[PDB]
Symmetry: C4
């Protein structure tokens, strides 16, 4: 096997087709499904799998009580076959911890899990299913990373981490790994003022990450990484189509180099594909809560501060719960271009549905089509009353 | 691996032997078995598997309530090891949707799943477990396909789809795929007036599909496909042994080029092997309901409008529930001829057994013998009262 | 891979060591374990597995009620990893039916399952996990076979079948298979008057089967097969150490060519290793019921009508339930000799334990040692009161 | 594959990072998790797995009652994927018995399980998943072994066994195996007065075992084995940092060649890494019970009778239950040195938590870092009240 190189561009995105869906919460009402959150999707050369952070209990288990909580000793990064649910019996543990990323470099997979108390967390970098490198907290305040796949180019897999305040300036670092070893790291540069939970994809030897400004911004910060030079830039999506949550209503002119204000100290992980006219943004439909999900085609969103939608697709109705969302692609597919994909975490339980004592999610995932396909909506599908 | 070619003829069918049976409904009374319907069987070069459309819940799960319904966002094409039940933990998801087909071309497998609302459905064609092609609804009325295996020849895998009314003229298309790409499609031609749910098999470089005329016909339409020329014909089985359900009583002369009338706007998926004197037809024993199942040897059924049975075999007693049935063969077996096989879907629950709130099925499957074997009957075997 | 040849002799048997044990009934009290009976063990070149006839329900399932019954449409030959229990999720179905045998020829495995009603049963012979040959009932009275592994030599795998009365003369046949095809069959010859359920092993190009004379004999019939010549002999074990069940008390002189009388129309599957002074016989400890199990070293049991034990080993106490027992060996092990092995079926439930409505078993299995090892006893270990 | 050679030294241990954790007791509250104790970890060249002695029942099963008991016929050595729980459906049985060890020699794995009654136990040595050698009890008093991984060098895998009193002189033997055969055995020599449950690791062609003096010593005996010469020495850890449990308070001067007295006839399996200044000792935090766990860096512990800690790491708080602990390494990892690893058995249930009727455990495991990482604590995490 050789290291994968990002030699292709994105396929033209004219619509999105259904790729995977696990129905985990429906199925786990009566089967041994692990409680999760922070899911994602990631491909190896021969298989694509679902990933998430387990809470180390089943949904129906008494230990599901309290699983709104983020960072326990009972969490792990797990993977499981595409569109199956994360069960006790089919879930493979990649590493232990409560914040993660993972990617395949074409030879083997790197997985990163962070664990520890808030003031003393550490990353362990796994390569070829063995621990290779460890990184201690630099700011002693919840060292944390992407919660979706990283991307590699010629063996170099950049990863974005943050350590420090979630509601103020923090210390974000881009690490450049190869075979699980640190080649280099850099502090965040450019005009993004706060970075969380980057969602990344690669094309033509450039990695683009769309992140969450949890501090001030309802526009999303974007980091663009050159994995050969091992350098990067940052800015915000210029478009007035604002894509964090919660957020203010859309203005007519956005901000390229500044957080678009109105909402502080909150957000949600999200993603975009930023490719000139072939630009699509995901967001919650609601401006107030993690409900609904839609894709909007917003030509030149990254660079055009008045760019508005020219096309769209509803993924999840506004009357259904959504959650995190992130990018991945099958870098090992056939053909001449990389097909954009994404997932949405469909959160069930607390805090929105507090008649149950748990928090979990299921997954829906879609990839782009060059057709203009009909749209459906893809809810979680579980009846919460069944769990009472 | 090279593409499989249909170089052999059918083995002489003198009786049917038991091939597989999953007992899914019996076993799922107390284990984590998924609710299904629309099952089938399909072989790879090294393994044969059961397939079906999951309902995204277990039988015993509270989400089983309402699973009579056909087309939800919670359905997927699943496969699982031959004669095992479709469990949460052993079922592999092929694609998401509520109508499907799948076949192996000798190199890898193509799987097709259709999803969406009634007026905006789309097919996604998977090849080598990756999405390759998408097809939008052309008639905006429940785009839909075979619900059993397709067949390939030298890499060309024809698939029959219908879009439009189920009770009137519709727009049926034969698509010719290779490596998940569209080579060609053609509208239905010939004298079949309505096509649903084709059941196909191949021999000597010809693919024969027996389908369901849901509109007017209680004789079954037959499509015969030349996968080299990528052309086809259609007609009806001429025999007065009528093989849809519900149906009128058997006449003494059938119809070759016209629906045999008497029952409108209903049917059931079924199959036949049409091979001169080596012709066997499957049907429900009941003319009114999906109960019982039998095979009848009906020499020259396709072409002889007075052909009557010369031999038969009971598969399921008339006092037991049946369901859909379809053809498959192990194209990769040893020997000089292709052994005809079929499955029967043994539907349990609604609408016939409405003391439960679910609908599911198990599978029985048989292949032909050159012996004249003794017959048994093969019911589902679950006691519905246990589920109350 | 080449066909295995029986080139080695038996290892000297000085005691028996524990080989496998599944604890199935203990574990299935609270996990999804299939009801079984008629278990055995059989090796492939790279793995040894447990086998049995499923009843197509879990123990705890409501469908367990009635599983004393032998021959339903819901039974199948299953295999599963050594010493695991037969679960819904780990059990591989080899074929469908209610009487079986299976063996690996060094290239691939042959599995045979018989199904049907009593007057119309048929064997299907599977090779390389595909059906190849079918055999119809010749006597129309419960066509049936070994219920333990067959043995192969240079691709020829003899199998013993019986069809006809269980309490009178019947029609026993030795079939010689190769690649699942019939080379030859012969009717039983020699002085055994009735044959059931043969337990076989091979050494130095001879296959020895110890069987059950269900009609008149409490000594066990022995068939010895030359798989090159495809010929056989039969007689009884001459020893007065009688090894069927139920049985009369041991006399001082047995019978070589005649059933030893006293008990009619009953028996149990069992086995022996017949190798001159290296001869060991298994039997129930009880003369009346399937309770206890012991191995006795009985030099020249086959040929010496006064041979008595010189050594022994208790396997199951007389205060614990036993069941069927049978021979197998790992023909693909290292070293200079074939290590004798056996299993005992530990039957629980009906008819002996009729406060439950089911019948099932677990498995214990032992292989020979050239040491003189200490003995333990190996009960099933489940508490029946837990299942009430 | 070639036999692994112990060519590398230990990596510098500056802290410990989380490696694996199964959360078995939390998860098994509502899934089919086997009851275990005596767990460990062991690597093959391509995978690292958890191991333990099953009790042949699930936690939630009624057969969990009585599982404080050590030596039943229902126990087996099982392995399962790293950080998964030991479930009915994912656990592979290595051999049957109630005391074990296992190691991979670079070509294949050797597994040893001892079974039998107290006065007549026997070891079966498995190699390449087949039984090869058997050893009968020599002292007729609970023949028993390591309960953690053995280590191999050029195919020679030494194993320590004890037979005889647990509270007095016993007969300890070092066996040297290759391909599951006995090359040699030696009686214990040197100044260790009693040996139980050795925990071993290899580096630079030397194997170091830290064991449990159950009779008189609260310092741990150490056996050092030359696997080329097939010879060994024994002594005690000289350090006054005493590491058995229960134990007296730490003195200021320990004992090199004598048990450090104060506590008799009890202990716990434990481990150390003894590598000059790079020496780390594990122990319970409590001197009275199996509660808490910590690692202490104790330069020259083996040889310096006044050596005290220079660094440490808390693994399990003193308010949480611990248990056995043992060493393993991934001998097949990349890089220039062997990374020290260990596990801790987190015992739940009896005798400490006697409102439940069972005894089980989960596993936590850590490996060394050359960083100085932040510490967390890693409890079992189950709420016992949930099981009432
Ligand atoms: C079968 O399935 C097919 C395929 O899915 C279905 O067809 C799809 O139908 C949907 C639903 O209609 C479409 O999605 C919407 O797309 C529009 C964009 O397209 C419109 O606008 C285009 C651009 O117009 C401008 O520029 C052009 C030139 O470039 C100029 O010509 C024009 O005059 C104008 O200045 C038009 O080009 C486009 O027309 C084309 O397509 C038409 C078909 O759609 C066709 O009829 C025409 O002939 C022509 O070919 C069309 O007019 C998106 O704008 C829209 O998204 C907005 O609306 C939804 C609610 O519906 C909302 O959730 C979105 O967030 C977004 O609106 C919010 O954000 C805006 C931006 O800031 C803001 O301006 C809005 O006020 C609004 O803001 C509020 O809500 C947000 C969210 O809660 C909040 O944050 C704010 O604060 C505020 O509160 C949809 O995405 C698909 O594109 C369409 N697909 C295809 C291929 O056709 C079909 O319907 C299905 N069939 C059936 C039978 O069901
Ligand atoms: C051990 O197992 C073995 C193997 O399975 C069992 O043996 C099997 O036994 C079964 C049951 O008997 C057989 O199935 C039936 O087969 C007949 C066909 O064979 C008969 O007819 C043949 C053709 O006769 C005509 O042509 C020949 C020349 O070609 C001419 O010679 C003759 O005079 C005549 O004109 C005969 O050749 C054949 O004889 C041969 O075999 C005999 C053994 O069976 C033997 O005795 C002879 O010596 C000779 O060798 C024999 O007479 C099928 O017709 C039949 O199917 C009809 O009946 C069932 C109900 O039983 C029904 O469900 C079917 O749908 C079908 O009848 C319906 O459809 C007809 C066609 O339209 C219609 O005409 C009928 O009125 C009827 O219609 C009604 O019901 C349907 C369905 O609900 C409904 O839709 C309509 O509207 C209407 O209401 C069975 O398939 C096996 O062939 C046989 N197999 C073998 C190899 O022998 C054996 O019994 C078992 N042993 C034990 C002890 O149990
Ligand atoms: C640690 O583990 C070790 C290893 O397992 C344990 O040691 C084992 O201990 C057991 C139990 O004692 C032994 O099993 C029994 O073995 C005897 C056979 O050995 C005896 O007889 C030998 C032959 O004697 C004759 O010939 C020799 C010359 O060849 C001649 O020298 C002699 O005078 C005589 O004519 C002796 O050689 C042998 O001695 C040797 O070994 C001794 C140790 O055992 C040692 O002390 C000596 O120094 C010497 O080296 C010894 O005397 C079997 O006969 C016996 O089986 C019978 O009894 C059991 C009940 O215990 C029964 O279930 C069996 O079915 C069988 O008896 C039935 O069948 C007989 C045959 O028809 C019949 O005659 C009996 O009346 C009886 O029949 C009744 O019951 C059956 C069954 O219900 C029913 O069907 C009938 O109708 C009727 O009702 C046991 O198998 C092991 O061999 C032994 N192993 C080893 C290697 O030592 C050790 O005990 C454990 N340690 C501890 C501390 O527990
Ligand atoms: C973020 O995470 C990081 C990384 O984990 C956390 O930092 C870690 O913090 C912990 C907790 O403090 C440290 O663990 C302890 O380490 C000490 C050893 O280090 C001390 O001593 C060193 C040696 O001192 C001696 O020699 C030097 C020269 O070699 C000489 O200079 C000196 O004067 C003296 O003679 C010092 O070098 C060392 O200083 C260095 O590090 C300091 C940071 O820790 C730093 O401040 C300094 O500048 C300098 O660089 C330091 O002083 C262990 O001794 C200690 O273990 C004892 O205590 C615990 C309870 O805490 C107990 O459980 C242990 O068993 C042990 O004490 C028992 O055993 C002793 C030996 O027999 C006995 O003497 C004691 O009385 C006691 O015995 C009793 O209990 C036992 C157990 O129940 C019982 O059996 C007996 O019978 C009796 O009842 C801890 O292991 C880590 O080393 C440290 N790691 C790092 C890299 O810094 C950080 O805190 C986290 N951050 C936050 C914000 O939480
Ligand atoms: C700690 C700040 C961080 C990003 C703002 O919080 C995240 C927010 C989350 C959220 O908004 O749902 C859930 C994440 N599991 C959590 N991350 C961690 C590591 O706890
Ligand atoms: C039909 C006669 C035969 C041997 C005597 O009966 C066997 C006895 C059995 C028994 O004695 O326990 C159980 C077997 N499952 C049964 N075989 C079949 C095929 O039903
Ligand atoms: C028999 C003595 C031995 C070591 C002291 O006892 C061990 C103590 C144990 C303990 O201290 O927890 C549990 C072990 N399972 C047990 N070993 C066996 C084989 O029973
Ligand atoms: Ca924000
Ligand atoms: Ca019809
Ligand atoms: Ca008998
Ligand atoms: Ca359950
Ligand atoms: Ca001690």
């Amino acid at each position: 096997r050789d290291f994968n190189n990002l030699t292709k561009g994105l396929c033209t995105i004219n619509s999105w087709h259904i790729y995977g869906k696990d129905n985990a919460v429906r199925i786990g009402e009566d089967s041994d499904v692990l409680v999760t959150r922070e899911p994602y999707v990631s491909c190896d050369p021969d298989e694509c799998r679902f990933y998430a952070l387990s809470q180390g209990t089943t949904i129906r288990g008494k230990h599901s009580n309290g699983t709104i909580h983020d960072r326990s000793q009972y969490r792990a990064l797990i993977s499981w076959p595409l569109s199956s649910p994360p069960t006790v019996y089919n879930s493979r543990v990649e590493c232990i911890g409560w914040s993660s990323t993972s990617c395949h470099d074409g030879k083997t997979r790197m997985s990163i899990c962070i664990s520890g108390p808030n003031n003393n967390a550490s990353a362990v970098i796994w390569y070829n299913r063995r621990p290779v490198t460890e990184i201690n907290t630099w700011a002693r305040n919840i060292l944390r990373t992407q919660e979706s796949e990283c991307v590699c180019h010629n063996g170099v897999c950049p990863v974005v981490f943050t350590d420090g305040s979630a509601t103020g300036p923090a210390e974000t670092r881009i690490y450049y790994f190869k075979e699980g070893k640190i080649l280099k790291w850099e502090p965040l540069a450019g005009t993004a003022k706060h970075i969380e939970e980057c969602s990344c994809y690669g094309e033509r030897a450039e990695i683009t990450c769309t992140c969450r400004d949890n501090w001030q911004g309802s526009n999303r910060p974007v980091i663009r990484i050159d994995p050969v030079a091992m350098t990067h830039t940052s800015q915000y999506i210029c478009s007035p189509v604002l894509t964090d949550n919660p957020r203010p209503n859309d203005p007519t002119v956005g901000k390229c180099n500044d957080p678009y204000p109105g909402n502080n100290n909150n957000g949600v992980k999200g993603f975009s594909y930023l490719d000139g006219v072939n630009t699509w943004l995901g967001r919650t439909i609601s401006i107030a809560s993690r409900s609904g999900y839609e894709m909007l085609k917003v030509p030149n969103a990254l660079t055009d501060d008045k760019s508005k939608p020219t096309q769209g697709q509803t993924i999840v109705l506004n009357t259904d719960w959504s959650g995190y969302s992130g990018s991945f692609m099958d870098y090992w597919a056939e053909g001449e271009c990389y097909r954009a994909c994404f997932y949405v975490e469909l959160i069930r339980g607390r805090p929105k549905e507090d008649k149950v004592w748990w928090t979990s999610n299921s997954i829906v995932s879609m990839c782009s089509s060059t057709e203009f396909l009909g749209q459906w909506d893809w809810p979680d599908g579980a009846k919460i009353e069944y769990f009472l």
